[PDB]
Amino acid sequence: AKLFSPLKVGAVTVPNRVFMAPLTRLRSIEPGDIPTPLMGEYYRQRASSGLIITEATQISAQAKGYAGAPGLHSPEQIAAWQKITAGVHAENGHIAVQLWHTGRISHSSLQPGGAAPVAPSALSAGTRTSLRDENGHAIRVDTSMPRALETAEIPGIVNDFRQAVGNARDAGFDLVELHSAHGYLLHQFLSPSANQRTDQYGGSVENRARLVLEVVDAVSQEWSAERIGIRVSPIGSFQNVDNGPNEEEDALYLISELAKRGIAYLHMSEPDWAGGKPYSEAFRQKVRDRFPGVIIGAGAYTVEKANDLINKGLIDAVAFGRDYIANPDLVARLQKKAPLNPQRPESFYGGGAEGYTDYPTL
Numbered sequence: 001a002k003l004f005s006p007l008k009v010g011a012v013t014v015p016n017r018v019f020m021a022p023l024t025r026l027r028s029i030e031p032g033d034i035p036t037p038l039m040g041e042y043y044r045q046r047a048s049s050g051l052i053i054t055e056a057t058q059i060s061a062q063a064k065g066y067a068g069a070p071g072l073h074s075p076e077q078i079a080a081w082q083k084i085t086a087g088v089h090a091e092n093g094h095i096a097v098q099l100w101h102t103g104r105i106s107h108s109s110l111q112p113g114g115a116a117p118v119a120p121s122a123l124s125a126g127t128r129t130s131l132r133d134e135n136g137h138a139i140r141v142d143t144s145m146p147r148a149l150e151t152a153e154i155p156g157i158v159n160d161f162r163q164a165v166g167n168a169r170d171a172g173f174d175l176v177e178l179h180s181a182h183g184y185l186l187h188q189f190l191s192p193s194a195n196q197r198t199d200q201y202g203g204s205v206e207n208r209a210r211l212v213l214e215v216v217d218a219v220s221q222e223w224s225a226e227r228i229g230i231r232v233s234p235i236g237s238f239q240n241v242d243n244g245p246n247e248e249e250d251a252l253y254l255i256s257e258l259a260k261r262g263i264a265y266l267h268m269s270e271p272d273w274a275g276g277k278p279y280s281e282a283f284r285q286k287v288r289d290r291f292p293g294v295i296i297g298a299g300a301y302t303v304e305k306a307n308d309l310i311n312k313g314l315i316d317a318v319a320f321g322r323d324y325i326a327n328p329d330l331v332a333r334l335q336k337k338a339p340l341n342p343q344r345p346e347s348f349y350g351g352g353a354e355g356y357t358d359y360p361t362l
């Protein structure tokens, strides 16, 4: 029953702890990377969630690495998001925008001027991203070799997160979630496998965490620390980005730095979903010891797991991913122990209403 009780999340009080994890769906309008009324209906259908966390959204045009992913850096984008947030709030829902810079998980055809994408170091991501073929359908393509950011360019990255959070506030969102996970730009700097820099942003864990903490500080001053959430994936390997040979201690360092800044929540994307070893309770307790604020757990969660960890005080809420794709009233289904619709993975990425707004309620 506690999974269905209210929770204060920074400045915002949500009615339950069944959260919608951020899910890239690649249905935005190109050119311009504009959210659509169809996306608004998708999110409106899921506003019984205690907190919707949007698909990852570009902080700038440079941030783009997927065709079809939305932006929050242009007046067109802001206007369209404003209708989405209004739609969710008119269902008495709550909504946070996940903000990313994709870094080296990108393609030069998606970048301003067709230039190479940026990263902490000029090292191939060794993975693929999603473009659109001439008929508008998602296709997987090798990422482009990135250019290493100059030291003097790091403030511009911070400044672009800062402005994007300003726009998130103007656009009506309740919170923002910094995307510091899954091998995108912030995680690239955190990871010794993607970051081989020789300036103050590479090497030691203090140098590697510096950018993400500069971002947290800037966006907290732009809006408020109690409006800032962050998603991390600091244990295991994700999209070919690992967390180095001291991953547990390094993770606990970052978590303690985040706690010092009073942020609204810590959202941990666990490896049990991808194919790694799941968090031990001893690790979870070390996290909790360092982070007394809201912790969101994610990745292959049962209701059993959710109750267990919530009743134990180790997490405060759970973000459901694929089950939210297929079940707009997931909250009701979980309370009533009803069954779930089956997922149609062939329509997760790209397309239109089918596999998106056409999953039914009880």
Ligand SMILES: Cc1cc2nc3c(=O)[nH]c(=O)nc-3n(C[C@H](O)[C@H](O)[C@H](O)COP(=O)(O)O)c2cc1C
Pocket (backbone or CB within 6 Å): 021, 022, 023, 024, 025, 055, 056, 098, 179, 181, 182, 231, 269, 273, 298, 299, 300, 301, 319, 320, 321, 322, 323, 348, 349
């Ligand atoms: C289609 C799809 C899109 C996703 N998009 C994002 C994203 O934009 N940002 C992010 O942080 N995680 C993203 N994820 C990871 C999920 O948010 C989630 O954490 C993961 O799938 C495991 O949780 P689950 O077992 O409930 O699906 C995505 C996953 C899927 C399947």
Ligand code: NA
Pocket (backbone or CB within 6 Å): none
């Ligand atoms: Na040089």
